[PDB]
């Protein structure tokens, strides 16, 4: 529709998944709020527009079309008002900083050690599959009450949910271009139900200290539980992003550090720098890159565009975190970048509920890795490819070390 952006008509979904930076660098300059035809939605690409939409009283939560097809209702990311307040009150207790501090070390450190012990003497590893993803999913899985679900299975589920959630391509008429791409998400949800329904059955009668047990029972009248259909979409929210993103973040941090070998050495020598390294990693490749959306509740003007009420806007936080209005050479990883705010955890009422937990999982995991393999080196015989528009991270991370 917008004449000077007619080039956007030729942007493909594959291009956004493999490398969205070049298109989004153009958007941040030409149209910070732009309608992207293949996504069928306005997209916010700069830090100012993302922050404004995410915090505006004239926007509220919505799920993208493919996200809604994947999760249904009421997913915590896509609801408002009394339902959202209830779901936030449901998930927040185990995520409270003072609560996390009581058990996070005893949770993650033995998990990290267990996975490291399988390969720390090999001289070679593929860290995404052998370390980052397993530690991420085993940590949260145990917190949730899914101790009996293998990390292989948790990893398969978040991968299938990822592909379904981000199956966003639409054709001329706004219809999904890849309707068969939701089937593996449906297959994952069916498997999840088969595993989790018996656990919910027993937690209803025998509550325990698992997070999902508390989701059923906390704040409810005596002898009542939240209905499982009411909580399952938020379970899916966790089994996608909460399972995937800490692993994405630590892997992207490592890739960034490998790109700056002097900085990798610094961090290995001084592990108190790991939190700073992770924060730059999340800015540099944001795990939740463009998954979330908001919808306008009244006519509103954003970046010079007059949006009617009812207009969805996708929040491309991963682009916002390369805003050259804020950062110098954002495409480069730099441990010594001056600490500034970033949007990798979103903003506003629907900002990430698990920041403190997530940052601790990534920090402990990197601590234990650099302890066990101080001479870690990137396998330069291999290249690192990143994949994902909605959720983005490296697809593998081959490393080596002298044994
Ligand atoms: C490095 C890892 C993570 C990153 C980068 C991340 C990022 C985000 C982002 C960007 C949002 C969306 C905010 C928006 O649309 O404005 C979000 C939402 C959320 N995240 Fe995190 N997340 C991470 C890990 C986790 C973990 C481990 C948990 C749970 C233990 C978690 C729980 C949640 C919840 C419940 C929401 C929805 C909040 C709401 O809609 O009210 N996140 N996260
Ligand atoms: C925390 O997990 C999510 C965040 C945004 C979209 C999908 C998710 O699973």
UniProtKB/Swiss-Prot annotation:
EC number of this enzyme: 1.14.14.-
S-S bonds: none
Catalytic activity: guaiacol + reduced [NADH--hemoprotein reductase] + O2 = oxidized [NADH--hemoprotein reductase] + catechol + formaldehyde + H2O + H(+); 3-methoxycatechol + reduced [NADH--hemoprotein reductase] + O2 = 1,2,3-trihydroxybenzene + oxidized [NADH--hemoprotein reductase] + formaldehyde + H2O + H(+); anisole + reduced [NADH--hemoprotein reductase] + O2 = oxidized [NADH--hemoprotein reductase] + phenol + formaldehyde + H2O + H(+); guaethol + reduced [NADH--hemoprotein reductase] + O2 = oxidized [NADH--hemoprotein reductase] + catechol + acetaldehyde + H2O + H(+)
A single GO molecular function term of this UniProt record: monooxygenase activity
Binding site for substrate: 237, 241
Purpose: Part of a two-component P450 system that efficiently O-demethylates diverse aromatic substrates such as guaiacol and a wide variety of lignin-derived monomers. Is likely involved in lignin degradation, allowing Amycolatopsis sp. ATCC 39116 to catabolize plant biomass. GcoA binds and processes the substrate with electrons supplied by the GcoB subunit.
Protein family per UniProt: Belongs to the cytochrome P450 family.
Protein name per UniProt: Aromatic O-demethylase, cytochrome P450 subunit
Naturally occurring in which organism (per UniProt): Amycolatopsis sp. (strain ATCC 39116 / 75iv2)
Gene name per UniProt: gcoA
